[model samples]
Target: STGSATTTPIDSLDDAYITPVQIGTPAQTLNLDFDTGSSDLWVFSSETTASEVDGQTIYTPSKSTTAKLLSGATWSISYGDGSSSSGDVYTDTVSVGGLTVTGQAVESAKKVSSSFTEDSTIDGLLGLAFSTLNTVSPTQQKTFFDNAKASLDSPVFTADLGYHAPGTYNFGFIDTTAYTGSITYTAVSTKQGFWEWTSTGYAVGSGTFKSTSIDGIADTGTTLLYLPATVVSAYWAQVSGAKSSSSVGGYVFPCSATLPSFTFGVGSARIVIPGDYIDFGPISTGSSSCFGGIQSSAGIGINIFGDVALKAAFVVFNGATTPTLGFASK
Candidate 1:
């Protein structure tokens, strides 16, 4: 079986990607962030606290006859941003695009933090990482991809993220037309349940490529690209008015200043991130200072090839006996 879905950027900043998923027999649709960094298909539902519910869509499992309660099953997750949520579990018929999976575990949020409550754009998250990262206890649940992989034509999925427009997420087969040239495959180390790999090196603008091996995760959930302070400083240094601001909490620069392109290596292939993508709007609505899309990952302890980087290439997550990651420029 094969499935494909369109993932739309929630806002102008492309802060997050949201894809519509159908759950339960009656097919209640909710827009969810298909996060590759986490492993738990959770949603805002009727079980959620009424006070915490804002303008977001809520999944009503009671309305679906196929929904079955997973007795004694519960789950919780705490994010790096300090936001958290916990929930009860239910097995329901879940469908994405045209592919359907029976007895799919759907974590229903019973309590959520203020951060989630205030974000009206995202209804919940559809985890795409390894099932080993699942938080459901008593029995850990499998992720949607894991459950659907068996029926898929091939045990692989592709993420073709867009810069300012909608993009496509395809499963089972790779669309050759989606990318140009041949793809470069790299060995993935799933030591921590992340799609982590080593980047060969990087170059700032037209500078020489640095022969340094940088380890990072290709995270669709993260909004910006994060690298070591040395690499981040090298990129920002090229901008005339760029500076690290304590109050703004990151490297900021003049909104009108010219930015140089960033290039990273995948094996021998070089993927370039356009300079415009690095200028992530402004610090405030009408502020002259602009926030950078590429920032220092020193505080987080690991590098992250987030949206800013992912959008520059067509990525493939191969879930085979020996998993590998493929990158190709589009």
Candidate 2:
């Protein structure tokens, strides 16, 4: 299920943009996607027209004081949803919060369509997630985290998603007070960039599934948690008759029913996802199955645990040393 609505304005500079906290700093402003699936920093430019982009926040290079376009290089990116954009390369100073980094690599969208240039809510995206799915070629491009690691006081980065009630995703240092007591962290694995974990399965009402082994990756960028068809079907089997209907680009279930509770084990930490997350909304006509954030994406390679899963716990990405990530909650 989607969290409550929350959004904050991002500042745009001449060549770069900054979040609200870094407005007056010397650091260059950058557009970023607080994406959990991928880790990279990309921005739009004056070259991008108004008609080519859609549902994405666009940045105007002219608004900044230190924006510069790269002469020969070009860039393009595509998402799993069959959407893509191509543009020129640029370099400038970029800042986030009060932290500033100089000569950061960025992209300028020269040729865009409604598919990428529409909906101008925020200027860009700040990808504060992990680095496994980073589209940047290690040889040619470096991520924001890669460049900013040196300037940060600690190697840790925390995201406060429920900061202002659901929907508000806040980034930066971890808040120690948010946790119930002393927080525990799962050691980072040197596998892929994704936050890999093993789930022992679900516990509905009084029943529990501990023998099963469920492997999945947690991602904040993805709105829905993609699961194997078999696993999803198996989950429904235990929930009596949890029918499915389409809504919010995925399936929805009846929210009123006595939904099941799911527990995921990430190392020693066990996170429980409540039933409200499964019951999305009354989007469809007369059909309301609280849109199941978990959908069937079998054969889609990896099982993705999206924002819905994150709602159950707090995540900490520590990039202090090398590319290590620390997972924790408060």
Q: Which one is best on TM-score?
A: 1
Predictions in order: lDDT: 0.93, 0.53
Per-residue lDDT value at 248 in model 1 = 94
RMSD of 1: 0.8
Model 1 spans with C-alpha error above 4 angstroms:
none
User: 3 in model 1: Cα distance from truth in Å?
Assistant: 0.4
Count steric clashes of candidate 1: 0
Per-residue CA lDDT of model 2 for 1-330, tens digit only, reads 111113332211011122431211244333344655555456555567656655444456555566665566666666555556666656666655545566666666666545445534434545555544445443355556666666565655554444224334333455566555444455444376665665555444355545556666666656556777766776666665465544355445565666676665565556666655554455555554445656777646777777656655666666655444344444
lDDT of 2 at 220: 62
TM-score of each: 0.99, 0.76
